Amino acid sequence: PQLMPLVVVLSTICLVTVGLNLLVLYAVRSERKLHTVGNLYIVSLSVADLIVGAVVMPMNILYLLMSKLGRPLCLFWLSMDYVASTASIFSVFILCIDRYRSVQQPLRYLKYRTKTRASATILGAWFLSFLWVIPILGWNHFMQQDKCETDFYDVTWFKVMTAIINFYLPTLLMLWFYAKIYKAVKRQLNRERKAAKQLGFIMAAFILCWIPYFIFFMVIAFCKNCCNEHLHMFTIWLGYINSTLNPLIYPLCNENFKKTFKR
């Protein structure tokens, strides 16, 4: 009776998130000058972003309006949320791989940046994401140990290991890549400058949005009586606000999106 208007606001977030994602997808599939050989990489993120919104928005809202469906639907919800997040933070990983390779002194380079390899690496990211999904459905039947939380919530060590891997290794390798990109930018004395700003703003938006979620998650990872239902919702939804913002963060630095966004 005192939290429903907030639920309505989070529901209103859905329309703009889905609209922005579909707008980016249509922009890529329309303009040849915008149909860049590398833009397809970021498209993966957008596609993942779109999935996120849908597969998370009503269901999680249906989690808030209701108090504490069945097993298959909620399990699929968790699995697809996990695959969407992993696919996003590996589309960004592929983007940083490609920026690192392309800005590294391109003498015997620029010949491994085609579109077939773009599709191949996107397919590989999707396949590895599904391989990460498989544990969500099959935590049981592999090991032998009303609400539907993560199935391995009672297992602290696996939780810590997966969080550590899927945050540190992407984010730390990404910071390495961004630092070397910035070093190359500084030594190479504007489109490259705006690409650097785009990568920097995407980095700032995750780090800032998913540092509270991860810090509180890792505090939970060793103690149970340390976070209620409140200090977690306000972090998950800042992260999803970040996912919504990324389609609008794209034109801020790479503003070639002018004509296609105002057709």
Which residues are part of a known binding site for histamine?
81, 86, 166, 213
Q: Which is nearer to ligand Y5R, 81 or 98 (CB)?
A: 81
Strand partners, 1: none
Q: Which is nearer to ligand Y5R, 146 or 149 (CB)?
A: 149
Q: Is 143 helix (H, G, I), strand (E, B) or coil?
A: strand
Q: What's the sign of the alpha-carbon dihedral 26, 29, 31, 37?
A: positive
d(CA 258, CA 46): 18
Binding annotation:
81, 86, 166, 213
Q: Which is nearer to ligand Y5R, 162 or 260 (CB)?
A: 162
d(CA 78, CA 90): 18
**Cβ–Cβ < 8 Å for 180, 97:** no
The label of the residue with tokens 């590294």 reads 104
d(CA 185, CA 178): 10
* Least distance to ligand Y5R, CB of residue 110, Å: 30
Strand partners, 140: 143
* Least distance to ligand Y5R, CB of residue 180, Å: 22
Q: Which is nearer to ligand Y5R, 85 or 91 (CB)?
A: 85
d(CA 39, CA 62): 35
State phi, psi for 169 to the nearest 5 degrees.
-65, -50
Residue numbers at the binding site for ligand Y5R (CB under 6 A): 81-82, 85-86, 89, 162-163, 166-167, 210
Q: Is 122 helix (H, G, I), strand (E, B) or coil?
A: helix
**In residues, how long is the chain?**
263
Q: Which is nearer to ligand Y5R, 20 or 48 (CB)?
A: 48
Q: Which is nearer to ligand Y5R, 28 or 50 (CB)?
A: 50
* Least distance to ligand Y5R, CB of residue 221, Å: 9
* Least distance to ligand Y5R, CB of residue 94, Å: 15
Look up residue 43 and give its two tokens.
Answer: 């498209």
Q: Tell me the residue type at 71.
A: R
* Least distance to ligand Y5R, CB of residue 195, Å: 22
Neighbours of 89 (CB within 10 A): 20
* Least distance to ligand Y5R, CB of residue 167, Å: 6
**Residue 153: DSSP 8-state:** T
Q: Is 189 helix (H, G, I), strand (E, B) or coil?
A: coil
